[PDB]
Amino acid sequence: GIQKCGLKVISSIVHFPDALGAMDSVLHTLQMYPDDQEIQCLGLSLIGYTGHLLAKILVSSLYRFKDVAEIQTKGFQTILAILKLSASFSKLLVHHSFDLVIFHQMSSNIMEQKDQQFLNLCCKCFAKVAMDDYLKNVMLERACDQNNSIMVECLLLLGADANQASSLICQVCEKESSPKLVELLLNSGSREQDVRKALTISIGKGDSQIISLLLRRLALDVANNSICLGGFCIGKVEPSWLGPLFPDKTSNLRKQTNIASTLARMVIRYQMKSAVEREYITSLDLSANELRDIDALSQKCCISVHLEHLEKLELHQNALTSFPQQLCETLKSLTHLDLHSNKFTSFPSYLLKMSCIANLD
Amino acid sequence: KPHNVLLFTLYPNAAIIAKIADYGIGTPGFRAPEVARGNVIYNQQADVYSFGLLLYDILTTGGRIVKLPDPVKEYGCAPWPMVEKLIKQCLKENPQERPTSAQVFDILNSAELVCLTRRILLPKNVIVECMVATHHNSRNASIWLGCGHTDRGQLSFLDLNTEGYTSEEVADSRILCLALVHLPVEKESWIVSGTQSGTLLVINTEDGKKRHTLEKMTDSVTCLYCNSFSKQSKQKNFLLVGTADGKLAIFEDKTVKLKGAAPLKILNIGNVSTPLMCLSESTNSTERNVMWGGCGTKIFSFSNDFTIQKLIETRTSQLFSYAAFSDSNIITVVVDTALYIAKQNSPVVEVWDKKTEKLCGLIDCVHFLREVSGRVKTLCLQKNTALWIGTGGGHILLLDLSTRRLIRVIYNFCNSVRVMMTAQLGSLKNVMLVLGYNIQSCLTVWDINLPHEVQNLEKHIEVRKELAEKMRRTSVE
Ligand SMILES: CNC(=O)c1cc(Oc2ccc(NC(=O)Nc3cc(C(C)(C)C)nn3-c3ccc4ncccc4c3)c(F)c2)ccn1
């Protein structure tokens, strides 16, 4: 019990010149006393300069409470000092637990608070670990394993190979994720084959939101005003997927947040300073998707008003059996309809009721 | 031949789109002249003529299918020039003139090739700093470029569709800038330009004889602007003008219709010491009622009531940067979430904040140019957070507002960019018009999707290279 007041005496003597080991002693006490000793563990100066247990004890002490204002800033100053002593400390740091505490503190409403000096030290530590970009890829993998889209954008902006690894996008899409995260991964470069595998995955675990997010990248060309879903082997088709693909002119542009970009700008500055020191869609290709019916297109969710302006519908090389009559009257502006290589048995006469049909196949 | 090219998908952003196959079954239509004569030995260069013929067929969309003529003249098509230059270069009788296949691929790998839509070379005359755009979406697509070689002014009318222009000296004194006002309700489309003597002509593009002169100002004219208070508001439009004596005079678009029209209001923001140079409008809709302008070393922002809302002093800039560059008037101003400022004879760009009225960032174009005089001349900004920078050395810089990084550097097309601004043609597409030196004046039209096209092309070529290397290594293994 006397170790508490003993550490008080220790804090008194460290100010004297040539205090030199006492590092092993205080480490054993910190492992013994979690709360009180760690409150004064800021006295830990540059000592010992290689035991990973010491760094593990440091990070575990920071994370065990993670809600006391002073120990966070004190511990951040301590870890900043030791990484300046040795760059190899950064490797083991991000290896053990650095993400679990860093993401937690920077996402727990770190903004909108008068902690400018606090954020400055955290960004200084960020710019310090930003070196050896392989570590950044590790941080990205860990930041995607959890559902924290607030900091993934920062990692991408600092420069991270999103095609590093079962690639990243398939991992994110396999587990339940947020639309913001998959969007940020698609906007950054990612191999087309990886995106295709991710579409198959999200087809299995039916989720309209992620399906539309991917199809807006694979099979949409805004210049031509055409959906190009040709050969994706989407065994079915739902109007809730093609919904956001169509323009839906009611939608607008709004910057929801900017904290990530500004955070990225200041860590880049700190790294640089440390180095110095109408128009509807008129086509819908559904060919070769191994369909078996299109009955799911009837009084559709916001897709009915958009099909009225379709001027082409490629449905060839599928396996259909009929053409839904309700769709025939909804498609009030077709000119080119393609139905060849399907499996039909009798000509649907009502196909010739379409208002402007001009090329039937 | 086009018969021997296979297509896998029609999606432009695809890894593999076109493929080559020798069907195993030369031809009069596509015979190379060396092969056609037959007194030749096969050389790598021989296929380049066939490739150029393929390019000609693609440009003409198989017009030849159903000493070659001019691709534009023979069959109606978009100019899309540097591909025409490539066709001219490769289709050469001398075998040594044919570029190597690697060279052809490299010059085909340039995103400027896709972005550059049209290029017009004005005949030998005084270069035009003046530039206007047409609001008409009909076949009438033209600009109101103007030059002055004498005391009296002169104007030109150049139609992009017909590629022809008519020029005549109409103004008794030189013109320095122009504005265009459109009132389709009254079907009144008028062009106003200001004389260096200190008066203005307003001229109707429907009838060239509708020429009347406004009231006089003490000193010459620096800039003009025509402000529309959005298309969903009942506010009336105004012709703003900025003179060299700090006079910010407001003409009403209905007042100017009568001869001898009196300006309604005047603001004496500056003087001869700090003359007003330019005006700009806020890109975001949240400040569209707030108009900004660079009155020399001062920046004024005023609401729709013509009362100043904010003043910013540029004399605080030299505390960090060089004094001589900072001690100059601001030439161009871009209004967004952060103000972008370029001043006369300066190679650096300042970033101001509309809230703190304090410097937020510096853009050093000198470093960017040295990476590949450097004085910045003109600016323009678009919705997709990409900024275009015109330099005095004939270079164009592309930056992204998201990261303030360099996207691309454009050169070898003009000697010095004078002005550069966004426009819409008769097909409702948005393009960028750039005017540069060559002294000859050259006009270039660029696609508005230039940064996105650059990024897409870079990613696509990287993907293709990676796939090619991986499959070649797999084949070797
Ligand atoms: C709708 N879909 C279709 O219609 C469709 C049809 C289709 O039919 C075929 C087309 C071409 C080929 N074969 C080749 O192209 N061989 C080839 C390539 C080259 C290159 C690589 C040098 C160009 N050299 N030689 C090649 C090689 C050796 C030869 N020896 C003697 C004579 C000629 C030779 C040519 C084929 F087998 C089938 C394929 C895909 N889709």
Side-chain angles (χ1 to χ4, degrees), chain A residues 1-3 5-7 9-17 19-22 25-26 29 34 41 43-46 48-51 55 59-61 68-69 71 75-76 79 81-83 86-90 92-95 97-98 101-108 115-116 118-123 125-127 129-130 134-136 138-140 142-144 146-160 162 165-166 168-169 171-173 177-179 181-190 195-196 198-204 206 208-215 217-220 222-247 250-251 257-264 266-267 269-270 275 280-289 291 294 296-298 304-310 312-313 315-316 318-331 333-361, chain B residues 1-21 23-30 32-36 38 43-66 68-69 71-72 75-83 85-87 90-91 95 98-102 104-117 119-123 126-134 138 141-148 153 155-158 160 162 164-165 167 170-171 173 175-181 184 189-194 196-230 233 235-253 255-366 368-370 372-404 406-427 429-454 456-457 460-461 463-464 467-468 470-471 474-476:
Chain A
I2 203 177
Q3 286 326 95
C5 35
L7 208 169
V9 185
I10 292 295
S11 81
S12 317
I13 187 176
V14 299
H15 294 285
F16 211 80
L20 74 170
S25 316
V26 58
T29 73
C41 268
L44 267 292
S45 279
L46 166 57
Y49 261 94
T50 165
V59 178
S60 83
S61 45
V68 167
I71 184 175
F76 277 141
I79 64 149
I82 183 164
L83 60 80
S86 91
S88 200
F89 197 74
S90 53
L92 55 85
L93 178 64
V94 311
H95 175 272
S97 201
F98 198 47
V101 71
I102 279 293
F103 288 91
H104 193 294
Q105 60 114 22
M106 284 285 98
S107 291
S108 41
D115 292 29
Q116 282 75 18
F118 183 38
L119 314 181
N120 190 326
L121 308 164
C122 308
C123 305
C125 275
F126 260 106
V129 290
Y134 156 70
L135 284 63
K136 308 175 57 187
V138 189
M139 304 332 299
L140 195 62
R142 303 177 75 172
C144 292
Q146 300 112 38
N147 185 22
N148 51 272
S149 202
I150 307 91
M151 301 219 58
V152 184
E153 203 272 356
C154 325
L155 315 179
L156 300 161
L157 206 166
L158 274 293
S166 189
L168 275 66
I169 178 60
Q171 294 179 11
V172 185
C173 170
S177 308
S178 92
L181 181 46
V182 52
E183 196 276 339
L184 291 173
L185 263 177
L186 286 195
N187 268 26
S188 160
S190 160
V195 181
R196 179 83 57 95
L199 161 63
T200 298
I201 286 182
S202 162
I203 279 294
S208 89
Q209 210 49 267
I210 310 308
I211 287 167
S212 152
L213 256 294
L214 291 158
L215 295 174
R217 190 238 194 287
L218 277 171
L220 177 63
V222 279
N224 246 0
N225 308 325
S226 320
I227 319 278
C228 276
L229 299 158
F232 288 142
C233 297
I234 321 170
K236 63 181 68 172
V237 47
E238 297 296 332
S240 318
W241 310 353
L242 318 175
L245 293 204
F246 297 125
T250 53
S251 87
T257 176
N258 189 33
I259 57 154
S261 154
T262 74
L263 172 55
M266 52 159 87
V267 295
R269 176 199 317 118
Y270 288 173
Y280 312 93
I281 302 292
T282 56
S283 280
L284 177 61
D285 186 307
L286 301 187
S287 91
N289 266 336
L291 303 192
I294 61 180
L297 287 81
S298 157
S304 149
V305 72
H306 295 144
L307 292 181
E308 268 191 10
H309 307 129
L310 212 43
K312 175 166 314 171
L313 179 62
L315 281 168
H316 67 261
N318 293 357
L320 273 65
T321 314
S322 46
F323 204 86
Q325 160 176 19
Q326 49 88 17
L327 195 51
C328 276
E329 46 173 347
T330 291
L331 292 170
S333 166
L334 295 174
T335 80
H336 294 49
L337 182 63
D338 201 328
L339 297 185
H340 71 271
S341 318
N342 286 215
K343 294 304 299 156
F344 271 70
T345 181
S346 198
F347 187 84
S349 188
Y350 50 88
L351 286 174
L352 312 185
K353 286 256 197 43
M354 292 178 194
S355 274
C356 202
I357 187 75
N359 174 3
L360 193 40
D361 185 336
Chain B
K1 60 188 291 187
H3 169 244
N4 300 349
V5 168
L6 311 185
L7 274 297
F8 279 59
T9 176
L10 300 187
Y11 189 48
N13 301 347
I16 309 180
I17 298 176
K19 282 216 200 159
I20 312 184
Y23 276 116
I25 23 83
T27 61
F30 323 105
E34 286 66 30
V35 165
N43 199 29
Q44 286 81 14
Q45 286 167 351
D47 268 335
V48 181
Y49 193 89
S50 69
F51 180 79
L53 282 177
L54 201 75
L55 283 177
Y56 186 76
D57 303 323
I58 298 192
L59 193 54
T60 61
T61 70
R64 179 161 58 98
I65 303 300
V66 294
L68 264 60
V72 184
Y75 317 97
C77 53
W80 185 57
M82 293 183 286
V83 176
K85 184 177 180 180
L86 170 51
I87 296 193
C90 67
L91 292 198
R98 316 187 178 289
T100 62
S101 195
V104 179
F105 182 68
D106 298 334
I107 62 189
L108 272 171
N109 202 8
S110 160
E112 295 94 6
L113 193 74
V114 192
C115 301
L116 185 48
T117 49
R119 171 181 208 131
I120 322 292
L121 198 65
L122 187 70
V126 181
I127 311 97
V128 296
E129 47 163 346
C130 299
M131 281 215 87
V132 190
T134 175
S138 305
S142 178
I143 62 171
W144 292 98
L145 73 165
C147 54
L155 271 299
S156 298
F157 172 82
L158 168 56
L160 295 181
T162 64
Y165 85 109
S167 61
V170 290
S173 291
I175 59 148
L176 296 172
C177 294
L178 280 79
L180 194 151
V181 57
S189 52
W190 293 87
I191 295 94
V192 56
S193 191
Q196 61 182 358
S197 57
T199 50
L200 294 86
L201 293 175
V202 175
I203 319 169
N204 190 11
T205 186
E206 319 297 330
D207 197 0
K209 296 306 295 175
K210 305 320 277 202
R211 306 176 283 93
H212 67 282
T213 301
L214 279 299
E215 309 306 337
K216 175 90 80 160
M217 311 75 77
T218 308
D219 197 359
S220 176
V221 190
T222 67
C223 58
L224 281 72
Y225 182 42
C226 178
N227 194 295
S228 63
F229 294 128
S230 88
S233 86
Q235 289 166 111
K236 299 177 175 203
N237 302 323
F238 287 102
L239 282 168
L240 277 166
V241 305
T243 82
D245 282 336
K247 267 62 154 190
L248 179 65
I250 304 99
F251 301 109
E252 155 74 14
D253 58 357
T255 296
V256 297
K257 205 153 180 165
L258 56 89
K259 300 174 286 304
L264 56 85
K265 288 179 88 200
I266 289 170
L267 171 60
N268 313 333
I269 175 65
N271 290 115
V272 56
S273 64
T274 186
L276 164 56
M277 294 297 102
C278 60
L279 292 160
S280 174
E281 197 184 329
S282 177
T283 43
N284 204 334
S285 59
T286 61
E287 266 176 26
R288 274 183 168 161
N289 299 327
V290 181
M291 284 73 74
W292 305 62
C295 174
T297 181
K298 319 273 180 42
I299 304 104
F300 64 93
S301 86
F302 70 100
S303 53
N304 283 4
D305 299 337
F306 305 136
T307 63
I308 298 171
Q309 312 291 141
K310 199 149 281 171
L311 304 157
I312 307 173
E313 176 62 89
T314 319
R315 303 320 306 128
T316 67
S317 60
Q318 69 263 14
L319 307 185
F320 285 166
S321 176
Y322 196 49
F325 294 115
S326 294
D327 202 2
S328 198
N329 284 357
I330 300 168
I331 288 306
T332 55
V333 61
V334 163
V335 185
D336 199 0
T337 55
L339 294 174
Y340 300 89
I341 300 299
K343 60 183 70 65
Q344 194 172 3
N345 214 316
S346 67
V348 71
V349 172
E350 198 168 7
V351 178
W352 290 95
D353 174 38
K354 43 194 191 177
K355 305 287 150 268
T356 64
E357 306 97 10
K358 185 62 69 177
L359 181 138
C360 287
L362 73 165
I363 309 302
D364 45 354
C365 305
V366 161
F368 304 139
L369 294 202
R370 294 325 164 203
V372 182
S373 74
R375 315 157 184 131
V376 66
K377 268 275 194 172
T378 180
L379 276 297
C380 171
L381 188 66
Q382 46 182 356
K383 176 54 211 83
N384 55 30
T385 72
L387 175 75
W388 302 49
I389 295 91
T391 79
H395 304 261
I396 278 182
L397 298 173
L398 275 298
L399 305 184
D400 51 344
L401 304 190
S402 65
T403 60
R404 287 186 188 178
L406 188 153
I407 293 184
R408 206 134 173 89
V409 180
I410 320 297
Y411 52 98
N412 65 62
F413 76 107
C414 74
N415 296 19
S416 167
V417 164
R418 292 300 301 273
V419 298
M420 81 77 78
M421 61 80 71
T422 176
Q424 196 183 45
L425 305 189
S427 65
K429 62 187 185 296
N430 286 317
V431 292
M432 295 299 291
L433 275 61
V434 182
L435 196 144
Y437 289 167
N438 216 341
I439 315 180
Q440 192 70 332
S441 64
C442 185
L443 184 141
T444 69
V445 185
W446 309 83
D447 190 4
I448 200 68
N449 290 284
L450 195 151
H452 297 315
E453 182 65 28
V454 163
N456 293 334
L457 185 62
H460 160 89
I461 193 54
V463 161
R464 284 198 98 250
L467 267 180
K470 181 264 290 180
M471 183 179 72
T474 304
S475 61
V476 171

